[PDB]
Design a protein around this ligand. Structure first.
Ligand SMILES: [Fe+3]
Lengths: 354, 115
């Protein structure tokens, strides 16, 4: 409870409900079997009947624990996340917090406040000063950042640009590292993880954000301009989102974060009553979160600028892949480590570090 | 063959031939059955509760290409269970395998034996 900022009776009741969502060993065995096959068979709704039966049984478990569950306000089931001051943060203390599976996503409040990016970077500023910058993107190889920024500033524009998060912008443009303050992130992770992927995200409100999904690596979101509202659920409640795979690196879910909570109450009651954690990521704020933390992102300002850094576990001594970080969903390690595509992908990352 | 499969914070013994799997915990019944499994002695599965996976005999699904599959037609039930136990398909979970006839045991993950 002390790891979150609860502000109502309904929020507190939702939080106290969380342990009753956790799957028993037989339910875990069937969830493992289902999710393993959903990847291997490339079948998003494999064992949909079991999943449906599980949701019904799990709702009955909540109703047994909370007889007047129907009365609690599903609109007020969002719990504000606590943020930290990283002024006196050392890499050793940080790496312990990252390795602690009981810790929720870590938000460093105003960590990048004194960076050039946070101080100066806007859609307007980037257009005139960064005319040569190219990013991996396409309309829904590489395109000029200026071209994307201009199109996003044009109200009459037709084409929206999808920016690929599997890029290396800091490899392409090493000067940007100190500008966005990425060296602070590298310092915190030195001897723990190496930066596998880096990308700069620029958007208007024609892209509303990202729907429920989860990552298979450590992610760092560097908020530069505008505000994004992040939703999270505990990894052990991931199953309520109806998770599936679009390949090993496409860990998706069918839960629509946009929908009214009273609409969810009818169709997805587990999600409706579940405690959902949220943070408003403001310029200078950095959020760190480990593997299998489901999240949705909703753009709340007309324009946003955000840098993303994906980190992979390394051993400096050996140079090779580091031991897999402790997690609340170790079953996903077993599933992904069975996929030869994912195994090769992880080795290709390490070949690309050298 | 019989397979010791890891599902994160617990191991289970899967017996495809019998359509039975047994969840192992830190108790006498589990440790004694696990000892028999590893040591190549007759395994007393009677002292554990047998479960089976909650896929329907008539499981039907679509792949991402929208191609339609039905269990017992495009994929056999035997082939589906292979994809959870065999070294080729679920090596991330496979702790050990036991030959049913000879009672010969191959241990892959020694670190996962004691949970
Ligand atoms: Fe994400």
């Amino acid at each position: 409870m002390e790891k979150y900022d609860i502000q109502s009776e309904t929020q507190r009741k939702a939080f106290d409900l969380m342990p009753h969502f956790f799957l028993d060993q037989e339910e875990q065995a069937n969830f493992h079997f289902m999710m393993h096959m959903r990847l291997l068979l490339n079948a998003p709704e494999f064992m949909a009947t079991f999943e449906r039966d599980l949701f019904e049984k799990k709702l009955a478990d909540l109703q047994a624990k909370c007889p007047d569950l129907a009365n609690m306000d599903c609109a007020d089931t969002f719990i504000k996340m606590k943020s930290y001051d990283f002024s006196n943060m050392d890499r050793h203390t940080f790496q312990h917090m990252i390795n602690d599976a009981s810790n929720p996503p870590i938000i460093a409040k105003g960590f990048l406040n004194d960076t050039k990016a946070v101080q100066q970077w806007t859609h307007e500023y980037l257009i005139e000063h960064y005319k040569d910058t190219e990013i991996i993107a396409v309309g829904y190889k590489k395109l000029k950042l200026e071209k994307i920024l201009r199109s996003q500033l044009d109200k009459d524009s037709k084409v929206s640009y999808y920016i690929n998060n599997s890029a290396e912008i800091f490899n392409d443009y090493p000067d940007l590292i100190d500008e966005v303050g990425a060296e602070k992130i590298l310092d915190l992770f030195y001897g723990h993880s190496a930066n596998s992927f880096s990308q700069l995200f620029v958007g208007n409100l024609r892209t509303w954000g990202t729907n429920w999904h989860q990552g298979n690596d450590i992610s760092c979101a560097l908020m530069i301009s505008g505000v994004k509202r992040w939703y999270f659920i505990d990894p052990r409640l991931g199953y309520i989102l109806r998770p599936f795979f679009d390949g090993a690196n496409g860990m998706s879910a069918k839960m629509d974060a946009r929908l009214d909570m009273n609409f969810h109450k009818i169709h997805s009651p587990l999600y409706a009553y579940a405690p959902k954690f949220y943070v408003d990521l403001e310029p200078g704020d950095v959020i760190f979160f480990t593997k299998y933390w489901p999240h949705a992102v909703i753009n709340t300002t007309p324009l946003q600028i955000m840098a993303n850094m994906r980190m992979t576990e390394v051993n400096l001594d050996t140079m090779t892949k580091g031991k897999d970080v402790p997690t609340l969903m170790p079953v996903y390690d077993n599933i992904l480590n069975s996929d030869p595509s994912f195994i090769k992908f992880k080795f290709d990352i390490f070949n690309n570090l050298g | 063959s019989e397979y010791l499969i890891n599902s994160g914070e617990f191991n289970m013994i899967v017996c495809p031939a019998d359509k039975a799997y047994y969840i192992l915990n830190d108790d006498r019944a589990s440790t004694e059955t696990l000892q028999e499994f590893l040591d190549g002695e007759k395994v007393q599965y009677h002292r554990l509760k047998p479960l089976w996976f909650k896929y329907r005999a008539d499981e039907s699904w679509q792949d991402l290409n929208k191609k339609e599959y039905r269990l017992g037609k495009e994929l056999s039930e035997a082939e589906l269970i292979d994809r959870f136990v065999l070294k080729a398909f679920n090596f991330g979970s496979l702790v050990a395998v036991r030959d049913s006839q000879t009672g010969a045991v191959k241990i892959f993950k020694r670190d996962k034996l004691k949970m």
